[PDB]
Amino acid sequence: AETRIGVTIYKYDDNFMSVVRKAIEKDAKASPEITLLMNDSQNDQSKQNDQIDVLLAKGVKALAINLVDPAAAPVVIDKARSNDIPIVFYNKEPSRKALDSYDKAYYVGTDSKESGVIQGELIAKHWQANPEWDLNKDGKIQFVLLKGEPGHPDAEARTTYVIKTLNEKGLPTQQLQLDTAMWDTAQAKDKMDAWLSGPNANKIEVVIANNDAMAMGAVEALKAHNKTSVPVFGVDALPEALALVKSGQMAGTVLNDANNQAKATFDLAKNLAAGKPAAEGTTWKIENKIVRIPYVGVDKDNLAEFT
Ligand SMILES: OC[C@H]1O[C@@H](O)[C@H](O)[C@@H](O)[C@@H]1O
Ligand SMILES: [Ca+2]
Ligand code: NA
């Protein structure tokens, strides 16, 4: 006996979604009647759309979709609803209007703003404890920021709220550079290397990255330029970032809870595949069809909890 569930990951080479992918597959092992059909959309929404057509033709009873493009949620909804197939969107949040457009569309993710606020609180905490970080002694944080994908809710909120949080805590900032590296380590290394080769190089006091993968690239570029005392902040708490916090090569990150997002996505998909209320028999709190899993700030104080 078997219930098929189709799953997409927007790109398997995304560091964070690779963690989520493995956690989904691990959780599915405990429900041997489920057969997961797991797909790498390779960062291409048209490929994902074709994959969804195949999954529906192969008789999946639910879809768990990590969109390539958040704006494509209506296309996916239109495909799934033809035969009343439920969708748990996850990690890339569709619009409220898209979620409300189909009774069987749900979302599992995070409060994106919370991660920006926590990151700003972490930067404030360390800035206030490290007066030497104010290289030009002007009382302002001269920073560069590595942004995630334009329009991605986590990139937009982390970028807006890290700065609002710092400023509201009484720490003025000066944005020397702000550009996207598309969540990617190599793009971030190249972008940081360019900034370190230009006129703002010696003015940079803090590196803020919307994720750990981009922070890791910035760390490499800082090392190449012998700027290892410029602090770097990320988001996700990837193992590699936790190792950099331990060595002092990153100042802080924020746990993006892949384990519980994967478990909630799988649990909701499994209930919906059976025609049951989405959170039945689970602890997940659905609020207007959305589950949000808390972020947690991580630095040297609480690092031992995570390694
Ligand atoms: O959608 C993918 C993105 O999701 C974000 O929540 C993670 O912080 C990023 O690392 C990841 O690249
Ligand atoms: Ca300064
Ligand atoms: Na994992």
Side-chain angles (χ1 to χ4, degrees), residues 10-11 14-17 20 66-68 90-93 107 110 112 115 148-149 152-155 158 182-184 210-214 235-236 238 254 256 261 295:
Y10 93 94
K11 74 176 191 207
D14 184 272
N15 304 57
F16 176 74
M17 293 309 298
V20 175
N66 177 226
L67 284 164
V68 176
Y90 67 112
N91 164 268
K92 297 211 198 180
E93 189 173 351
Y107 181 70
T110 70
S112 300
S115 62
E149 286 163 344
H152 187 298
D154 287 327
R158 291 169 190 168
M182 302 297 279
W183 306 123
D184 181 78
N210 284 176
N211 77 348
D212 286 342
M214 292 183 302
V235 172
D236 283 341
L238 299 180
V254 182
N256 192 351
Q261 288 174 71
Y295 289 99

Side-chain angles (χ1 to χ4, degrees), residues 4 14 28 45 48 65 81 104 113 121-122 134 150 178 193 200 239-240 248 253 264 276 279 294-295:
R4 287 184 174 183
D14 184 272
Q45 185 66 49
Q48 182 168 97
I65 302 298
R81 76 186 307 155
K104 302 185 178 60
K113 171 183 176 180
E121 288 167 345
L122 280 172
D134 189 9
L178 189 159
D193 187 87
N200 285 326
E240 295 94 328
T253 184
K276 303 302 186 159
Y295 289 99

Side-chain angles (χ1 to χ4, degrees), residues 283-294:
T283 62
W284 308 117
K285 308 288 233 293
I286 300 178
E287 308 268 14
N288 203 186
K289 308 197 299 172
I290 298 182
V291 175
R292 299 191 194 277
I293 301 305

Side-chain angles (χ1 to χ4, degrees), residues 80-100:
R81 76 186 307 155
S82 300
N83 196 222
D84 208 29
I85 303 303
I87 302 155
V88 183
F89 288 104
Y90 67 112
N91 164 268
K92 297 211 198 180
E93 189 173 351
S95 69
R96 182 76 254 175
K97 175 180 182 185
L99 287 177
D100 288 338

Side-chain angles (χ1 to χ4, degrees), residues 127 133-142 172 174 203 205:
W127 174 265
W133 286 4
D134 189 9
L135 299 175
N136 73 340
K137 312 286 179 223
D138 71 350
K140 299 183 178 186
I141 303 174
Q142 271 76 34
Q174 183 181 14
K203 300 183 184 170
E205 296 169 349

